[PDB]
Curated annotation (Swiss-Prot), chain A:
Residue numbers carrying Phosphoserine: S72, S159
Subunit structure: Heterodimer composed of a catalytic subunit CDK5 and a regulatory subunit CDK5R1 (p25) and macromolecular complex composed of at least CDK5, CDK5R1 (p35) and CDK5RAP1 or CDK5RAP2 or CDK5RAP3. Only the heterodimer shows kinase activity. Under neurotoxic stress and neuronal injury conditions, p35 is cleaved by calpain to generate p25 that hyperactivates CDK5, that becomes functionally disabled and often toxic. Found in a trimolecular complex with CABLES1 and ABL1. Interacts with CABLES1 and CABLES2. Interacts with AATK and GSTP1. Binds to HDAC1 when in complex with p25.
Gene this chain is encoded by: CDK5
List of residues that carry N6-acetyllysine: K56
Disease: Lissencephaly 7, with cerebellar hypoplasia: A form of lissencephaly, a disorder of cortical development characterized by agyria or pachygyria and disorganization of the clear neuronal lamination of normal six-layered cortex. LIS7 patients manifest lack of psychomotor development, facial dysmorphism, arthrogryposis, and early-onset intractable seizures resulting in death in infancy.
Activity regulation information from UniProt: Inhibited by 2-(1-ethyl-2-hydroxyethylamino)-6-benzylamino-9-isopropylpurine (roscovitine), 1-isopropyl-4-aminobenzyl-6-ether-linked benzimidazoles, resveratrol, AT-7519 and olomoucine. Activated by CDK5R1 (p35) and CDK5R2 (p39) during the development of the nervous system; degradation of CDK5R1 (p35) and CDK5R2 (p39) by proteasome result in down regulation of kinase activity, during this process, CDK5 phosphorylates p35 and induces its ubiquitination and subsequent degradation.
Protein name: Cyclin-dependent kinase 5
Species annotation: Homo sapiens (Human)
Post-translational modification summary for this protein: Phosphorylation on Tyr-15 by ABL1 and FYN, and on Ser-159 by casein kinase 1 promotes kinase activity. By contrast, phosphorylation at Thr-14 inhibits activity.
Lineage: Eukaryota, Metazoa, Chordata, Craniata, Vertebrata
UniProtKB/Swiss-Prot annotation, chain B:
Location of this fragment in the whole protein: 145 to 293 of 307
Lineage: Eukaryota, Metazoa, Chordata, Craniata, Vertebrata
Top-rank taxon: Eukaryota
Name of the featured protein: Cyclin-dependent kinase 5 activator 1, p25
Cell compartment(s), UniProt: Nucleus; Cytoplasm, Perinuclear region; Perikaryon
Amino acid sequence: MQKYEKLEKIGEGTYGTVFKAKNRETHEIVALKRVRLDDDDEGVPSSALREICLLKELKHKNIVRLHDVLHSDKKLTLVFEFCDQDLKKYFDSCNGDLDPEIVKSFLFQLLKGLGFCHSRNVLHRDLKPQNLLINRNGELKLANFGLARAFGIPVRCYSAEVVTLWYRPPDVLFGAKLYSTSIDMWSAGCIFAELANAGRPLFPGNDVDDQLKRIFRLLGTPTEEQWPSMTKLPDYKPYPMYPATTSLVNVVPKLNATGRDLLQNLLKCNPVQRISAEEALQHPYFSDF
Amino acid sequence: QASTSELLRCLGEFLCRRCYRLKHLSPTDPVLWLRSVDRSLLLQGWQDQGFITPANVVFLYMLCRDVISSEVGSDHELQAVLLTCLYLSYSYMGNEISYPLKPFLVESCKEAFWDRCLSVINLMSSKMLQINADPHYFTQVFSDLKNES
């Protein structure tokens, strides 16, 4: 663009290419996500248009801010606030070793942003460390809404092919075609565990089957009484019954009993039982914060 | 009055009434254009099921009522604007990650298409979310569409 000077290419766009840039008029540093419109990758503008539609309606300190959208050349440019790094890179920077106060701050900010999305009837559906941006002020922002969607209108189904595998909840792994805000809450629990240990995925499954096994191996396999509809899900198949007795103490060593309790409320297999973002923010984990 | 075919006919009758300059427009014309796009996406492998359902037609009508000018000057222009609204509907409400431009493009000037998308989004982004968030609003739109016949 004429108003913006490109500084560096810094970005694994989720669907396009991200650049660090300077607004020539105000001297402010921003991030530009550029999208070719004379495509050869036919469907990209579609995701970008959806992200623009949603981000226009999602203005909160903990959601990445879309400032403007430009259309020039054969290019769509989204102008975003600039953030120095994502959580994935941040883990590499600190040897995966966060102070427990920063673990708490990061989870709190994630939940505030996520709670805001859910209260506005938007599911993120791709919550993972690379989609979490962090400032040098220590501010965390949910980003990359290209898989997100508004929810509420009567629909026959949603896609079960949502959420990066390692962050996908068991109901969706079992092919549930209807899910609610609970989908993101599971992913938040996964991120929480990485924050509270050494910044490595809790459940790095190789495929859907391995994914479910890793989850149940740690948390226990749900019984019919805990999750009556489980066996009725479209891609259900019988899993071993792993005991619900396995301690998480060493899985999340940065956490006290209070933190472990919140973690378990996020990582409930039955989506109906999963804590909401609003409820999580009222959890005693955040009381002295 | 709940079936897709009936609601689509309601939308077609609405567009004919809205676009008073289009003397030779048939109420089935918009239905043909919409169904054609949906069939093409299915056959070509872009989606496994059709997008055109009662709820999505209501969503589309909500866009059309605010975006489509009574002053549209040709059937071609109506098709281009309608298909822009349809493309935004697939993009926003569809179950696939993305959809190709080709089936929605009937104009030579691609830049006009993209400018139209952005203009519609600037106008409608709030209502696009509100129709999902507010069941009463969705009901109002649905009732309005029904009463278009």
